[PDB]
């Protein structure tokens, strides 16, 4: 039934641990995190420095490592609730960065992770702030057609985007002309559900800070578009 506070669980011994350079060491840390939350069921939205301890091995050199932290992100998810909208742009923009590996199982993982805190936030703290742009900006073909594809699935079911969405614009602009064609592809698959909300007269003026032959065909495919919605 009730919820605890666990900051008092994440010991400076447990930190430091998790951020070891051994990985069997590291993998220790995240065993007891992982226990500690799942002995909780329910916890409180403080958890000390979790947060900047499951940042580090969002990335670690260890893709199991990565993969348990992502497990644990959506258990955290579920153990919190909605709280977890208050750890989005300091734990979960990094959550997003994890799109951008090469490997699909660990990129379905990352997919999944967000998705579960997605249920209990909503979408409108992700779309906030150009926290998510600055990510689809990033010159990764893998993030990029992860986070379109998301956008793609997560917009038709909003109906209070911030003004803050026409941030990711430019860089869905450069998608479309992107050097991979799955992100071309799902840059496109997105362009209907971005005009949706921000409208076609935001859209084909954001065209004009691009250079004359991609403002050119941009607006033609931006015309298609205009077809629905």
Same mark, same amino acid.
């Given at each position: 039934?009730?919820?605890?506070?666990?900051?008092?669980? *994440?010991?400076?011994?447990?930190?430091?641990? /998790?951020?070891?350079?051994?990985?069997?060491?590291?993998?220790?840390?995240?065993?007891?995190?992982?226990? /500690? *939350? @799942?002995?909780?069921?329910?916890?409180?939205?403080?958890?000390? &420095?979790?947060?900047?301890?499951?940042?580090?091995?969002?990335?670690?050199?260890?893709? /199991?490592?990565?993969?348990?932290?992502?497990?644990?992100?959506?258990?955290?998810?579920?153990?919190?609730?909605?709280? /977890?909208?208050?750890?989005?742009?300091?734990?979960?923009?990094?959550? *997003?960065?994890?799109?951008?590996?090469?490997?699909? @199982?660990? !990129?379905?993982?990352?997919?999944?992770?967000? @998705?579960?805190?997605?249920?209990?936030?909503?979408?409108? &703290?992700?779309?906030?702030?150009?926290?998510?742009?600055?990510?689809?900006?990033?010159?990764?073909?893998? #993030? !990029?057609?992860? #986070?379109?594809?998301?956008?793609?699935?997560?917009?038709?079911?909003?109906?209070?985007?911030?003004?803050?969405?026409?941030?990711?614009?430019?860089? #869905?602009?450069?998608?479309?002309?992107? !050097?991979?064609?799955?992100?071309?592809?799902?840059?496109?698959?997105?362009?209907?559900?971005?005009?949706?909300?921000?409208?076609?007269?935001?859209?084909?003026?954001?065209?004009?800070?691009?250079?004359?032959?991609?403002?050119?065909?941009?607006?033609?495919?931006?015309?298609?578009?205009?077809?629905?919605?």
């Amino acid at each position: 039934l009730p919820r605890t506070e666990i900051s008092d669980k *994440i010991t400076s011994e447990l930190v430091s641990k /998790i951020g070891d350079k051994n990985w069997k060491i590291r993998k220790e840390g995240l065993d007891e995190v992982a226990g /500690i *939350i @799942n002995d909780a069921k329910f916890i409180q939205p403080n958890i000390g &420095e979790l947060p900047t301890a499951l940042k580090g091995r969002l990335n670690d050199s260890n893709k /199991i490592l990565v993969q348990q932290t992502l497990n644990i992100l959506q258990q955290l998810a579920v153990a919190m609730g909605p709280n /977890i909208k208050q750890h989005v742009k300091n734990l979960g923009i990094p959550i *997003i960065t994890v799109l951008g590996d090469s490997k699909n @199982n660990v !990129r379905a993982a990352a997919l999944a992770t967000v @998705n579960a805190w997605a249920e209990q936030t909503g979408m409108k &703290e992700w779309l906030e702030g150009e926290d998510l742009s600055e990510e689809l900006k990033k010159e990764n073909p893998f #993030l !990029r057609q992860e #986070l379109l594809g998301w956008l793609a699935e997560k917009l038709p079911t909003l109906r209070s985007t911030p003004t803050d969405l026409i941030l990711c614009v430019p860089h #869905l602009y450069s998608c479309l002309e992107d !050097r991979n064609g799955d992100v071309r592809k799902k840059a496109q698959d997105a362009l209907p559900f971005f005009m949706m909300h921000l409208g076609y007269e935001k859209m084909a003026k954001a065209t004009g800070k691009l250079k004359p032959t991609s403002k050119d065909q941009v607006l033609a495919m931006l015309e298609k578009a205009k077809v629905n919605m």
